[PDB]
A = this chain, B = another copy of it.
Amino acid sequence: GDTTITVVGNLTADPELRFTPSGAAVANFTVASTPRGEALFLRCNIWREAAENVAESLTRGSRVIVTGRLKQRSFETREGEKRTVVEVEVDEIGPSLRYATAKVNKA
């Protein structure tokens, strides 16, 4: 009964690819959806093979589509009150082809 969301915007920076102690890959990157005004920023993380893919393929400013689950987390009342935390656990991402072409490769 998870909650998905699709977001279209541009990466604020290059995707950060790292490897946990487990040996797994993570890409953290945040999307900027912009009316054309005040934008919607969303931290997204993707894992495993798709993360490496993202890192190779996408860059700063890259227009993307991202579908995934919204994961929130609340906190703060022993030091500053009423604070929230939000992100997307990406299921799929791809470079949008509205204003670009793409030479797709296999694996």
A residues sitting closer than 8 Å to B (CB atoms) are 1-9, 33-42, 49-50, 53-54, 56-59, 62-65, 67, 69-74, 79-80, 83-86, 91-107
Contact = CB atoms under 8 A, between A and B. Distances in A.
Nearest to A99: B107
A95 B102 contact: yes
B104 A98 contact: no
Please give the count of copies of this chain that the complex contains: 4
Contact of A104 (B37, B93, B95): B95
Nearest to A69: B35
A100 to B, nearest CB: 5
A96 B70 CA distance: 19
Contact of A97 (B8, B86, B94, B98): B94
A17 to B, nearest CB: 12
A92 B98 contact: yes
- Determine which residue in A9, A59, A79, A84 has the highest number of CB atoms from chain B within 10 A of its CB, and name it: A84
Given A38-B71, A41-B72, A65-B93, A104 B58 contact: yes
